Amino acid sequence: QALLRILKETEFKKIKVLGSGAFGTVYKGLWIPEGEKVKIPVAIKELREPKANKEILDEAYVMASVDNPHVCRLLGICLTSTVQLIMQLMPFGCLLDYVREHKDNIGSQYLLNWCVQIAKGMNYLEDRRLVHRDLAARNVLVKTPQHVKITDFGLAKLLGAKVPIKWMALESILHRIYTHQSDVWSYGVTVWELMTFGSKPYDGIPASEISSILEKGERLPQPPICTIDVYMIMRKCWMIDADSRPKFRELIIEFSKMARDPQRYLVIQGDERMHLPSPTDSNFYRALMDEEVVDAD
Amino acid sequence: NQALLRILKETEFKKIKVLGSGAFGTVYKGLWIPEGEKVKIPVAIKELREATSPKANKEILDEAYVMASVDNPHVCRLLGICLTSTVQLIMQLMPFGCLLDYVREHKDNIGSQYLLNWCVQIAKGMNYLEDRRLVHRDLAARNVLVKTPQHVKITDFGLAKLLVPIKWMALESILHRIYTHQSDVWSYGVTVWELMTFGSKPYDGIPASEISSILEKGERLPQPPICTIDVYMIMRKCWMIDADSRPKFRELIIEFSKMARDPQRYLVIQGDERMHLPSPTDSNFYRALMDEEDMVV
Numbered sequence: 001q002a003l004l005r006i007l008k009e010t011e012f013k014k015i016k017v018l019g020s021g022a023f024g025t026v027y028k029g030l031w032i033p034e035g036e037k038v039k040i041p042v043a044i045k046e047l048r049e050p051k052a053n054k055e056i057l058d059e060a061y062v063m064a065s066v067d068n069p070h071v072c073r074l075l076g077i078c079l080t081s082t083v084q085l086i087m088q089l090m091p092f093g094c095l096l097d098y099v100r101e102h103k104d105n106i107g108s109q110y111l112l113n114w115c116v117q118i119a120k121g122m123n124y125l126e127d128r129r130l131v132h133r134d135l136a137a138r139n140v141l142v143k144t145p146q147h148v149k150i151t152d153f154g155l156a157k158l159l160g161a162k163v164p165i166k167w168m169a170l171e172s173i174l175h176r177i178y179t180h181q182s183d184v185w186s187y188g189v190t191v192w193e194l195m196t197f198g199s200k201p202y203d204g205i206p207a208s209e210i211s212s213i214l215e216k217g218e219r220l221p222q223p224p225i226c227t228i229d230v231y232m233i234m235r236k237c238w239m240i241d242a243d244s245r246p247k248f249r250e251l252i253i254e255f256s257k258m259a260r261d262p263q264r265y266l267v268i269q270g271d272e273r274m275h276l277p278s279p280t281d282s283n284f285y286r287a288l289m290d291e292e293v294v295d296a297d
Numbered sequence: 298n299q300a301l302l303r304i305l306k307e308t309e310f311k312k313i314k315v316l317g318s319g320a321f322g323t324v325y326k327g328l329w330i331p332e333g334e335k336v337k338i339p340v341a342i343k344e345l346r347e348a349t350s351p352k353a354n355k356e357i358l359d360e361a362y363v364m365a366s367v368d369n370p371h372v373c374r375l376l377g378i379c380l381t382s383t384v385q386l387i388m389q390l391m392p393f394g395c396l397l398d399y400v401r402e403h404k405d406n407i408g409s410q411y412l413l414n415w416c417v418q419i420a421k422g423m424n425y426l427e428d429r430r431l432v433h434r435d436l437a438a439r440n441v442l443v444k445t446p447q448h449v450k451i452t453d454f455g456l457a458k459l460l461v462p463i464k465w466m467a468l469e470s471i472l473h474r475i476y477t478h479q480s481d482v483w484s485y486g487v488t489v490w491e492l493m494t495f496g497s498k499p500y501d502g503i504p505a506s507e508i509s510s511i512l513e514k515g516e517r518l519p520q521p522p523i524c525t526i527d528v529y530m531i532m533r534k535c536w537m538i539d540a541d542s543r544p545k546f547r548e549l550i551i552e553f554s555k556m557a558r559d560p561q562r563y564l565v566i567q568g569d570e571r572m573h574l575p576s577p578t579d580s581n582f583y584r585a586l587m588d589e590e591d592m593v594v
């Protein structure tokens with residue numbers, strides 16, 4: 001309707017590759033409004049290789065209609081040549097790179113608040129009857145360090161089908177069943193990446209072996225900073241019975257409760273000194289970057 | 298509320314382009330690097346013409362706290378300060394620049410709906426300052442910024458105090474240095490005359506030294522080609538010698554909003570029928586990219 005701008009190729013230019021994935025290649029780009037002299041930074045995802053434009057368009061309107069602070073909305077599309085998706089540029093990049101970069105400077109407050117925020121966005125997708133199919137720390141963007149957003153839901157659907165075996169629920173691997181509860185298993189793996197500061201899951205276990213190890217009951221290890229209460233939640237996200245798994249709305253509650261007493265739930269050396277921004281600093285960041293957090297008691 | 302003003306270290310930002318200059322300083326595009334991050338976030342930096350002492354500096358700060366407390370969608374808020382020997386003011390960057398340049402650059406290509414809506418928005422911003430008992434002292438089309446073509450904001454609030462534009466000034470300001478909300482209304486009327494002439498220079502061909510004399514004799518800026526009598530009478534009433542005979546900003550808001558509901562009745566612009574006016578789709582896209590903030594007839 002009014003939510004998806006159909007772009008002409010003259011309107012924008014791709015400038016520099018920012019990354020790539022199973023579904024396409026992301027560029028930092030510029031939008032040049034017609035009749036204007038300005039160049040506005042955007043991100044453009046050019047999709048890999050099917051579907052008629054009407055169908056892609058139908059799917060694109062859904063992507064354009066998500067409205068939640070923890071979910072990136074599709075802003076515009078250009079489907080003359082390839083399919084190019086236009087979205088807001090996030091100069092901070094993805095949460096996986098961010099946590100690695102900052103592994104010596106991230107506190108329990110940030111970590112548990114990101115868990116809440118990602119659960120909030122996934123709960124929203126579930127409300128909207130939308131299954132992501134590809135949740136991972138690489139798919140969560142940093143708008144500010146205090147504010148992250150899920151991206152790339154439903155690309156899996158749009159393009160059909162680099163398959164992310166190590167994030168997938170057992171049922172998706174064996175029977176290709178994808179549901180909101182399989183997304184819960186990926187959220188579990190995503191929390192595991194965060195709490196290990198960006199470790200690669202099952203590192204040195206070939207992808208082919210994953211179903212077998214899971215079937216035996218093997219799982220990702222307890223990250224050293226995690227108290228057992230944290231680790232128990234991840235293990236619950238990885239139960240064989242989909243329906244046994246927590247629901248996103250429950251994960252929001254549980255992580256929000258931990259975020260109130262964060263040093264009770266995560267043990268980080270020097271954590272007492274890593275806290276959320278002062279009001280002074282927060283007001284500034286928002287003004288510049290986030291015009292669009294749970295504290296300890 | 299001190300939390301509204303961020304105090305910055307010289308080391309966290311850099312100047313990268315000159316954007317312009319005025320009677321109070323030079324404005325730069327700059328980049329802010331959050332300490333410990335790799336990102337470069339564009340800002341506007343105004344560096345004052347006057348290097349100052351630690352003493353003068355504390356006067357500056359108390360006024361900076363006021364500038365930073367301004368919270369309204371049509372007035373720019375001061376975000377940050379650096380008290381380098383040369384005082385620097387940090388504020389959000391607007392890629393579209395000032396409204397004076399914008400209406401000159403689009404000079405006979407702007408529709409009545411835009412012109413009337415800018416007049417509403419500037420009066421809304423000034424009314425907010427009047428509510429707070431703050432006087433701008435330097436309103437002019439050069440000190441209105443374009444955030445998007447649909448959303449303008451007054452800038453430079455507080456500067457004139459912190460540290461003259463005769464052709465924008467009320468007679469009583471020229472004669473006696475008296476500045477009040479009603480002298481700001483005089484300046485608003487000149488600002489509107491700027492916009493309605495597409496950026497003509499006021500009293501062109503008349504030296505500044507002679508302005509008070511012509512005002513005293515009852516001479517006023519002339520009726521712009523596009524302005525109907527109803528619109529011109531509003532402007533003239535802003536320039537009554539008796540300050541309390543001038544309109545209030547609250548009345549200006551009402552009158553211009555009324556006009557904005559039937560813009561072709563009040564401005565007569567060749568080709569107005571074919572001018573761009575903004576579809577919901579184009580507004581959602583500008584807002585998502587450039588204008589997230591909580592804010593048109």
Ligand SMILES: CC(C)n1c(Nc2ccccc2)nc2cnc(Nc3ccc(N4CCN(C)CC4)cc3)nc21
Pocket residue numbers: 316317318324341342343386387388389390391392393394395398439442452453
């Ligand atoms: C230069 C002035 C109008 N300015 C102040 N002023 C200011 C006042 C107090 C504190 C900080 C800034 N804040 C500003 C924030 N943003 C922008 N933006 C902007 C300005 C100019 C330009 N261009 C490109 C087109 N060229 C024809 C002319 C230069 C492009 C973007 N200007 C600002």
Ligand SMILES: Nc1ncnc2c1ncn2[C@@H]1O[C@H](COP(=O)(O)OP(=O)(O)NP(=O)(O)O)[C@@H](O)[C@H]1O
Pocket residue numbers: 018019020021022023024025026043045087088089090091093094134136138139141151152
């Ligand atoms: N909107 C954006 N703003 C800034 N960076 C982005 C944006 N979108 C994507 N990126 C970057 O591009 C990288 C990869 O993009 P993407 O095409 O999503 O592949 P992926 O997410 O890494 N893997 P895949 O799970 O297969 O999609 C992300 O990890 C980010 O580093």
Ligand SMILES: [Cl-]
Pocket residue numbers: 390391392393394443444445
């Ligand atoms: Cl702008």
Ligand SMILES: [Mg+2]
Pocket residue numbers: 020021022023024152155
């Ligand atoms: Mg992708």
Ligand SMILES: [Mg+2]
Pocket residue numbers: 021139151152
């Ligand atoms: Mg993706």
Ligand SMILES: [Mg+2]
Pocket residue numbers: 319395439440441452453
């Ligand atoms: Mg200015």
